[PDB]
Amino acid sequence: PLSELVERGWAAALEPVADQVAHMGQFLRAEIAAGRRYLPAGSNVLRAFTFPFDNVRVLIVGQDPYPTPGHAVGLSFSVAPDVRPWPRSLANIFDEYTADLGYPLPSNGDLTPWAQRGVLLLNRVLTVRPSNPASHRGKGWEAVTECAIRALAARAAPLVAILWGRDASTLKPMLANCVAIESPHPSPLSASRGFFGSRPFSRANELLVGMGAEPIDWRLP
Ligand SMILES: O=C1CC(=O)NC(=O)N1
Numbered sequence: 437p438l439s440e441l442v443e444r445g446w447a448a449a450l451e452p453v454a455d456q457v458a459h460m461g462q463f464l465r466a467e468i469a470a471g472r473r474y475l476p477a478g479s480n481v482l483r484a485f486t487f488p489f490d491n492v493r494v495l496i497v498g499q500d501p502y503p504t505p506g507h508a509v510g511l512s513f514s515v516a517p518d519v520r521p522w523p524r525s526l527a528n529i530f531d532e533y534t535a536d537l538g539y540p541l542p543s544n545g546d547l548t549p550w551a552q553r554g555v556l557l558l559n560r561v562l563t564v565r566p567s568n569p570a571s572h573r574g575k576g577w578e579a580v581t582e583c584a585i586r587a588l589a590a591r592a593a594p595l596v597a598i599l600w601g602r603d604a605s606t607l608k609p610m611l612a613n614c615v616a617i618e619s620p621h622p623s624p625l626s627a628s629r630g631f632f633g634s635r636p637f638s639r640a641n642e643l644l645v646g647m648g649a650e651p652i653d654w655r656l657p
Pocket residue numbers: 497498499500501502511512513514523525526559600601
């Protein structure tokens with residue numbers, strides 16, 4: 437069960453939806469039986485919950501996994517290190533990264549280092565049918581990720597939420613102390629209509645330091 441699939445803190449945090457998680461496994465099996473595919477790979481579906489629950493300091497919320505085969509890797513916005521070119525959303529994220537932090541363009545699109553350092557890259561929906569954007573909305577994931585977000589918000593610990601999935605009036609209630617939400621809520625495809633210059637990374641660190649936490653080393657190889 438959950439203790440097998442996710443890190444100990446997450447298993448405890450996600451206990452209230454352990455049965456919903458089992459049901460999602462049954463759903464994915466029935467998709468394959470029914471002849472439909474799903475992304476990401478089954479081993480990557482719960483990957484965001486394989487980094488320590490207690491060590492999360494930043495939450496980045498997306499909506500659905502990349503629908504293009506070989507893109508989704510179970511961390512919102514991330515791609516495998518050999519994926520080129522980057523998806524539009526990630527290229528936009530990396531434009532803001534270089535603009536906000538003054539670092540050079542990353543070598544590749546792998547956000548694993550952010551996950552290691554306590555950035556939770558969480559999609560609201562953890563699977564998708566290939567080539568069918570947002571095809572697994574309403575299939576049961578929302579309850580699971582809602583439980584994750586409410587658990588995160590309940591900890592003593594500091595948390596900064598970045599909302600890159602334009603569902604702020606659903607998500608902001610789950611999150612509202614020791615939680616700062618970055619507003620407004622432009623998404624990476626908003627581009628020059630609010631996303632560029634939003635300085636999400638520097639502002640996360642100002643807010644963390646202001647709550648007595650260490651900043652994130654955002655630096656990618
Ligand atoms: O919401 C989103 C958009 C995207 O491009 N990729 C993700 O993993 N999340």
